[PDB]
Amino acid sequence: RMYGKGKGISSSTLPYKRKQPSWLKQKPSEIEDAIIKLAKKGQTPSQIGATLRDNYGIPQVKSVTGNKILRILRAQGIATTIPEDLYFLIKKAVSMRKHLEKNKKDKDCKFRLILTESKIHRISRYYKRKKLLPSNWKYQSSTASALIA
Amino acid sequence: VRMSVLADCLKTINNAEKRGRRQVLIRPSSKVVIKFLQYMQKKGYIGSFEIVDDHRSGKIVVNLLGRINKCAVISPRYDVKLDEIEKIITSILPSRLFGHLILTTPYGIMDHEEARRKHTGGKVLGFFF
Amino acid sequence: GSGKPSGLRAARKLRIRRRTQRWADKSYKKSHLGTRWKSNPFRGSSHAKGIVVEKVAIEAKQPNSAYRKCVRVQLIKNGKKITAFVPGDGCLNFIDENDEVLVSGFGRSGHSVGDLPGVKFKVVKVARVSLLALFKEKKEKPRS
RNA sequence: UAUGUUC
RNA sequence: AAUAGAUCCGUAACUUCGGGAAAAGGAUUGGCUCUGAGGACAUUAAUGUUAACUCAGAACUGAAACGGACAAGGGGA
RNA sequence: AAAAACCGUAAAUCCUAUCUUUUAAAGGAAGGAGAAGUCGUAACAAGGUUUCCGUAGGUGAACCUGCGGAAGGAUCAU
RNA sequence: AAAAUUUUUUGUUCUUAUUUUGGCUUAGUUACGAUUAAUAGGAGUAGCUUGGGGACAUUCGUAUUCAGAUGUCAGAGGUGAAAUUCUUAGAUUUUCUGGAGACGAACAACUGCGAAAGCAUUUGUCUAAAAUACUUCCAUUAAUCAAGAACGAAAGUUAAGGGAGUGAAGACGAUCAGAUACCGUCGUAAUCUUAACCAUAAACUAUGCCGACUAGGUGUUGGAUGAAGUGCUUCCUUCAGUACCUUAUGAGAAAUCAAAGUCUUUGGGUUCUGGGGCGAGUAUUCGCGCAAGCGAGAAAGUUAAAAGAAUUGACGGAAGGGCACCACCAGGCGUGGAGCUUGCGGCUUAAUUU
RNA sequence: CUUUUGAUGUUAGGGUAUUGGCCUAACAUGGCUAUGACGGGUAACGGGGAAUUAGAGUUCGAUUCCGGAGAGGGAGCCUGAGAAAUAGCUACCACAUCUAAGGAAGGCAGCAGGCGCGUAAAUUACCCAAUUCUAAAGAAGAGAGGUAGUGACAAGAAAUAACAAUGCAAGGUUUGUAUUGGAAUGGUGGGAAUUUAAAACCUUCCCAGAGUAACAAUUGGAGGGCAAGUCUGGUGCCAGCAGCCGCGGUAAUUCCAGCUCCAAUAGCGUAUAUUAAAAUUGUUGCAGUUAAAACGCUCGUAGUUGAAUUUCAAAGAAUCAUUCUUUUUAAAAUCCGAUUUUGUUACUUUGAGUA
């Protein structure tokens, strides 16, 4: 774990079968359109995959079609300018700062906000080392509330 | 963070045949550990190991003969010339008559004796005796 | 791990650690601190000539009981007052009150030796005549 | 469950 | 009585960190002849008209003198 | 050729400032060593108020007391 | 669009064009072109999930204390014993009412949460965390870290408020040879809240963080899996915590340690710290601080030990047993209370021999 | 930190033998730095090398050779191919010589030598014979250099005897051992050959020339560490010894002496420094619960370290039962069924150049 203690090995393990499940006679001719419609209706790719697994019964979009969900979203041009995890971290930091402004006596909240901003800086450094984020992206803490956009 | 995979592999091997369990599971397989294991095999220190090739950087199960006194890695992988082979050997191995100091060389994984007989010493990997 | 950086590019860290840490032992600090030249009276010399000021008896340590016969020497090289032990049974009588005397260390560098407290030097010859040549036997000529 | 030094 | 204007340089102890401070302490300053910098306005990137005194630099010059009169801190422990 | 002037090279001297090293000193205040010195008994046993930490105040001295800690406690325990 | 080749107008000299190829645009064709998804990490989703995690507001509880009332009358407090103190103006005690501040018992645990310091009345809101489950997403984004930053018990400092109880200082009363202490009565600062400082603790599991491996059992906390006594309770497996017991042909100087193991068969990664004792965490200097002080931090000199663990003994205003008239007790008989002999001390001793 | 006083760069020039902020003018605001700039210290000339090393390391290197710098401290300059020269010049500072007082003259960190300083270091010698340099180049010079003197700095070889007979001890007529008594040989003196520039030394030969072979070995110890005395006198907690532990107050195995013994030996002690010992500086290779030592805790940059994955095998000759040697097997350009290149670096292998 990045901060604190606890190994917490809870996760999801993909099946050995890499290919599309045999019982799925469904055709991949419209699964990408389904995810595109879902993203248009407004869903982050994580919950797009979750909704696809639950309500559509088509696990491992990568197995159904040899291309992964955020990748097809980018290929269609729908993908957001800020990656999902970084945006969620920014939202958490914005909420925490909004709370702290009212309660400056919340030392624990201040500490965890420092931790969250450290994570934000590390992951933004990674994303701008890749070309997934503009080189001038900084995350100043003043206008992050509207930076979600 | 595992850092070195072969170090953990050899430490697990060592603990295993110190316990004398005759069969040991090495979880993070790699090509380097595979070649190290084949060299140990060809020198007769282990049996017929089989790599369980799952879709997830699979594992290895190796049969032990109760035959290895100690296998270990050398970290960092010091680059050794052909000249300092003797200096490393008299400091690492228990005798000049048995034991193997494993080098990675421009011509692959090999021990000190055949590295000498083929020239071109390289980087040190580990040892077993 | 091991407590030390073992990486193939950790030579800077290891070297700096050793450089800082060698100041922690008495030997290296004593041999490499610039203080020694000004602190010790011999200024790094093995021997020194001086002028006898007077003779004094110094108490031995508590377990023993003796009056070690030492002399107070004004070093001509610097002008420092030192105390030098006079070896031998009746060698104090062999030295007068205003003579040139050659003194050396007591064998433990700057440390006291035996039950004698605070004495770090010993007389080796007076009036350029050896105390050994005067005491153990009169094999050499007497006092000039 | 008063106090009670030193060699 | 001693300088004392201005420009450039330099400025300690101590300190309530704001000061001390013009600390202390140095150099220069005239005249003349020049050089450089700092604006505004019109024509189909380029060419003309025109204004303040303000700095900086260089030659030359003189009985080495120039805040030439006036005006104008003595400092320090 | 003497001699003179002006740029330049620039020794040397002096003033000022700063730094470095060494060094005197009324008085003050430590440390170490010595001797059978004086006063008490602080610690080691529950050391006779368990000991110790941080902090603060007080007292001839060791030390005492308050607050919060630790067991290295005198309790591994209805 | 240019290069190469050739032909060529035409009096020291002016055209040209032809054909192959290096570069731009325009349909088609390639096996056209993206490695896993780490018992790495981050993000997400879900649970009549968990928790004394945090902040703000709010609620309750007895106790204590103050004030008022109430009934009665000699004491009440306190101690080893007392005294200081309160008390016919009614102390203490009984009952009731109102106020105040602090605290949050019993439940309460070798239990929970938190990075640590720390966190325990109710309820609400805000906020975060962790584990678990996942065929959800990204795909190396990670580990440890000089400098640097946040937090950091108590005490202390500053300024307002609060001020019951306790109580550094102080004042008395005791004890004692003394007692400025331990004990008692009182009592200022402080303790509490708010806003700032301070940045230190035996801040301790005296044990840095990440990773791998190595053994059985008893529990316990939070999830998830499967099954069964009665829509409901237990058992099985497993993950993540958290202790304990045993065991080591493992370690260690040993005490002991499941890590303090896998180390002369010495190398997984990384940070910090130490180098005999005293001087000394002193002096000096610098940074920080309102101050107290904090962080960094010597030297001269001095010294043969200091230090750790364990064994035997001795000792204990340590515990548990047992014994004795050179101990006491069921009980008495004497000496020193009476005078006298004798030995020794001692007393002047030519010697009163020792 | 540097940057007015050139700091970093551009442009133009000046200057130089030449490049260059080397300098000048204008312009721009750069240059270096926790991978330690800028400072401070060095009892710091650097290297070839030296000591100690099992391997790592630690310490030293003024000093044969190479490079640098200096000629009391600075600065300036002439000649010259070459000097910012110093047994060349000019000036200042500090010293210091002669003077008739007007003025002159100097630079041993060259060779000797002297004073001073010190713990600390040699002859005011001989010669250009060798090595080599300079010249008008055989023939002259050279304190370069060589030779000798002083020289227990270091280093090497190596005397202080060897042998025969009884007596004695040990042993089945074998070893050691106080007396005799003849050989051998240096040390030494002299002559010579020789050597040498001359001389000296070595070597060689010839005369003498060893019995207490007086031709006489010392230094430091004898409680332990550590080889060797509970032997004899003196002293009596004094004197003294003792690196450390300790000894010394009447029986001192430790002091002062004698005898004997031990160690090394023409050498042996002492002092200081340094290396090993020291795995007590630990990369190899230390330790951190309690011996010294995990930051109170977390975040975090530099640094250090970082999961797996992309081209695998078969067949053939030779030692002994194995080991060892050789060929190919995708795709793109090369040669009309065959002809031949297919990321960078670290690292590693071979060379080159190594006084």
Automatic annotation (TrEMBL), chain A:
Coiled coil: none annotated. Keywords: Ribonucleoprotein, Ribosomal protein. GO terms for molecular function: small ribosomal subunit rRNA binding; structural constituent of ribosome. Residues 1-58 form the Small ribosomal subunit protein uS15 N-terminal domain. CDD domains: Ribosomal_S15p_S13e. SMART domains: Ribosomal_S13_N (SM01386), Ribosomal_S15 (SM01387). SUPFAM superfamilies: S15/NS1 RNA-binding domain. One of its GO terms (biological process) is translation. Residues 1-25 are annotated as: Disordered. Pfam families: Ribosomal_S13_N, Ribosomal_S15. GO terms for cellular component: cytosolic small ribosomal subunit; nucleolus. InterPro entries: Ribosomal_uS15, Ribosomal_uS15_arc_euk, Ribosomal_uS15_N, uS15_NS1_RNA-bd_sf. It comes from the Eukaryota. Belongs to the universal ribosomal protein uS15 family. This is 40S ribosomal protein S15. It comes from Plasmodium falciparum (isolate 3D7).
From TrEMBL, chain B:
One of its GO terms (cellular component) is cytosolic small ribosomal subunit. One of its GO terms (molecular function) is structural constituent of ribosome. Coiled coil: none annotated. It comes from Plasmodium falciparum (isolate 3D7). Belongs to the universal ribosomal protein uS8 family. The keyword Ribosomal protein applies. It comes from the Eukaryota. Keywords: Ribonucleoprotein, Ribosomal protein. This is 40S ribosomal protein S15A, putative. One of its GO terms (biological process) is translation. NCBIfam families: PRK04034.1.
TrEMBL record, chain C:
The keyword Ribonucleoprotein applies. CDD domains: Ribosomal_S23. Keywords: Ribonucleoprotein, Ribosomal protein. It comes from the Eukaryota. One of its GO terms (cellular component) is ribosome. The keyword Ion transport does not apply. One of its GO terms (biological process) is translation. Signal peptide: none annotated. GO terms for molecular function: structural constituent of ribosome. PROSITE patterns: RIBOSOMAL_S12 (PS00055). Belongs to the universal ribosomal protein uS12 family. This is 40S ribosomal protein S23, putative. It comes from Plasmodium falciparum (isolate 3D7). The lineage of its organism: Eukaryota, Sar, Alveolata, Apicomplexa, Aconoidasida.
